[PDB]
């Protein structure tokens, strides 16, 4: 009856620049903020478009997951957040060597406009796990 | 021969974590807990990164230091514990905006992680009472 809930936070990632945590834990279902791939040291976006930006919000996802004992393989949803539709095919293509086992479930879609001006958000839903 | 011992304890700064003190005045030597960046009223770690962070561990220490009646002109000593060592530049400057006059002695160096997910952890070593 009174369960676990935690605000994850790791200095591997991105500080928060407004009023969210990293990551939540609650029970065992960790909702992770949408992450952009802003450099975890200097906060600013890596530079290079959505291919970079694309990996350094992964590696950010994966060092949040790293601080709530867990990985990508227990990530169970994730939102692609896309300033440009036609960059889906570049991105799958990068997600795809992060996720490689059960693959999460998946919603992809092109917004009007990202914070900072960025690419690509990639938002997460996790479950911690011994699995079956 | 019996001296002063005291358990510093101040509603603004970080409530002590079930064990510890804030800080301990024993004789005229206050020991401080190791400060972080964490607002008092939210229990959070403010947002902004390194630079937010000092300024918001420093604040935190100064209100410990009240409590005890001193000021940081007090403080013979602190260590700077940082997520980054190239971080060091820009809390060194933040660092003189409340250090003035007899500067501290000084140790910094990075350290693997820091509690909360925390980018730099201050610990200060102050002295009472008149000098000279």
């Given at each position: 009856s009174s369960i676990i809930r935690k605000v994850i936070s790791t200095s591997k990632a991105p500080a928060a620049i407004?009023?969210?945590?990293?990551?939540?834990?609650?029970?065992?279902?960790?909702?992770?903020?949408?992450?952009?791939?802003?450099?975890?040291?200097?906060?600013?976006?890596?530079?290079?478009?959505?291919?970079?930006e694309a990996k350094q919000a992964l590696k950010n996802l994966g060092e949040i997951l790293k601080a709530a004992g867990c990985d990508f393989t227990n990530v169970v949803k994730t939102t692609v957040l896309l300033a440009d539709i036609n960059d889906f095919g570049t991105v799958n293509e990068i997600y795809k060597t992060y996720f490689q086992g059960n693959?999460?479930?998946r919603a992809a879609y092109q917004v009007a406009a990202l914070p900072k001006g960025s690419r690509i958000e990639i938002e997460a839903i996790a479950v911690q796990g011994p699995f079956t």
């Open positions: 407004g009023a969210y945590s990293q990551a939540v834990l609650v029970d065992r279902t960790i909702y992770v903020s949408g992450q952009i791939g802003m450099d975890p040291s200097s906060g600013q976006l890596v530079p290079g478009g959505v291919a970079e693959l999460p479930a």
